């Protein structure tokens, strides 16, 4: 009745979807086979006559290896075989390859399955698109799919949980290029875009989980916990229920400005747990710490515009109000002059479930802060120099040109991220 369709595009999207669906199965008790030993699963799973619950997800990729890992892994009897869609040739970090030549048939089949999935949902709160800005599959195919969904499904709220490249550390070479291109694409399609940086999540794992040895499984587990906290109000009741439709209306001041910092609290290992009180005030302060975000972006450069807090577990509204009042009275935290309230509190009575084998501890309280702030323009400023530095010599441009892209596309993308910079400047300014 409150169904949300999940899409996972590219290696990063599918790998965070692995953690996301592990977390949802653990949260609702759905066994890996497909069935569980009310109606709280309907948001993410559709139950069949036999009792097997199949997730309302779609794994889209042009590379077969990542999807075959799912087809072979523990979750082979859970996911629908046709829902897993596999390509033949990888996008090879080429946005043109993933958006113009290879991605056409794949996205057509994807929309076929997406229509089939959406027909099985009475209502439809929206879409959760998990892709990787910084790779052709995530960038190109993800952009094409987002455009396609915006055109056909229309007013369904699409939450794009994008991972942008980190400031200094990166694994691709044309990553600034395809990141600029996909940001150019998704500025006009997604309704709420959640920013993530691998460097920031790595620092979180190094410092708070005390994981000197961070890896993709840990990063994806943290992301999955963030998304589960985001969706907890759809599946479990509680005081101050917040809806997918309520996110954008409480978080997006102006249509373009919809990119969002995400911060979870606490992130503490089982060893360090039960050495601190972890009260509502302390976890809220930890969430508002400049260091705690999953994006490498200091708020002290900017000002907060909106902050939506999602509390999970034994949380009382007086405690949330006291913590947020202390946050407002804090001098380090600064809001824009034109948004006096800037706070969207929502609570849920379901504590965050812990994945066995993970590092996150069993904490009776959890906070997911999704905030619109003018600081986030700094990361776009970083990519806007990373892009034009290479574009001065137009290196690697021939690869993108070969698959039906023109230099005008690059110029327009650069113009568009410059426009986004100016948007952040004007929202920050009085």
């Amino acid at each position: 009745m409150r169904e949300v369709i999940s899409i996972h595009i590219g290696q990063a999207g599918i790998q965070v979807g692995n953690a996301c669906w592990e977390l949802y199965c653990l949260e609702h008790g759905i066994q890996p086979d497909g069935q569980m030993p009310d109606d709280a699963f309907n948001t993410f799973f559709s139950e069949t006559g036999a009792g097997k619950h199949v997730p309302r997800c779609i794994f889209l990729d042009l590379e077969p290896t990542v999807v075959d890992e799912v087809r072979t892994g523990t979750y082979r009897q859970l996911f629908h075989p046709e829902q897993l869609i596999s390509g033949k040739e990888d996008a090879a970090n080429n946005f043109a390859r993933g958006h113009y030549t290879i991605g056409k048939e794949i996205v057509d089949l994807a929309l076929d399955r997406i229509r089939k999935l959406a027909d099985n949902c009475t209502g439809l709160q929206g879409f959760l698109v998990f892709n990787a800005v910084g790779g052709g599959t995530g960038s190109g195919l993800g952009s094409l799919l987002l455009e396609r969904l915006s055109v056909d499904y229309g007013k369904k709220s699409k939450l794009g949980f994008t991972v942008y490249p980190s400031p200094q550390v990166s694994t691709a070479v044309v990553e600034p290029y395809n990141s600029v291109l996909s940001t150019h694409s998704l500025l006009e399609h997604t309704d709420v875009a959640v920013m993530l940086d691998n460097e920031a999540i790595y620092d979180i794992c190094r410092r708070s989980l005390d994981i000197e040895r961070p890896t993709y499984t840990n990063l994806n587990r943290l992301i999955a916990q963030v998304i589960s906290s985001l969706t907890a109000s759809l599946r479990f009741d509680g005081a101050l229920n917040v809806d997918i439709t309520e996110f954008q209306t409480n978080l997006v001041p102006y249509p373009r400005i919809h990119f969002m910092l995400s911060s979870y609290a606490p992130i503490i290992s089982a060893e360090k747990a039960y050495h601190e009180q972890l009260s509502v005030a302390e976890i809220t302060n930890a969430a508002f710490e400049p260091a705690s975000m999953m994006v490498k972006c200091d708020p002290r450069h900017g000002k907060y515009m909106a902050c939506c807090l999602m509390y999970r577990g034994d949380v009382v509204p007086k405690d949330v109000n006291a913590s947020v009042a202390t946050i407002k009275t804090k001098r380090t935290i600064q809001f824009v002059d034109w948004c006096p309230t800037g706070f969207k509190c929502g609570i849920n009575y379901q504590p965050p479930t812990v994945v066995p084998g993970g590092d996150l501890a069993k904490v009776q309280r959890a906070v997911c802060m999704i905030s619109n702030s003018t600081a986030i323009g700094e990361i776009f400023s970083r990519l806007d120099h990373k892009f034009d530095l290479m574009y001065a010599k137009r290196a690697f441009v021939h690869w993108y040109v070969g698959e039906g892209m023109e230099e005008g596309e690059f110029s327009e993308a650069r113009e568009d991220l410059a426009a986004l910079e100016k948007d952040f400047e004007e929202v920050g300014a009085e």
Partner: protein
Amino acid sequence: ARVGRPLDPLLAPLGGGGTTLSPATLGHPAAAAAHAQHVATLAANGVML
């Protein structure tokens, strides 16, 4: 009901927006045409950006 702003000074060049449901009327045809023509002139002159 379809709603358009007839008194907005800034929206006057578009003509109130609305639906403009005909494909040639969709979006910003004049602005898109001008921008594409300018880009085409730059490309034909070889003036790399």
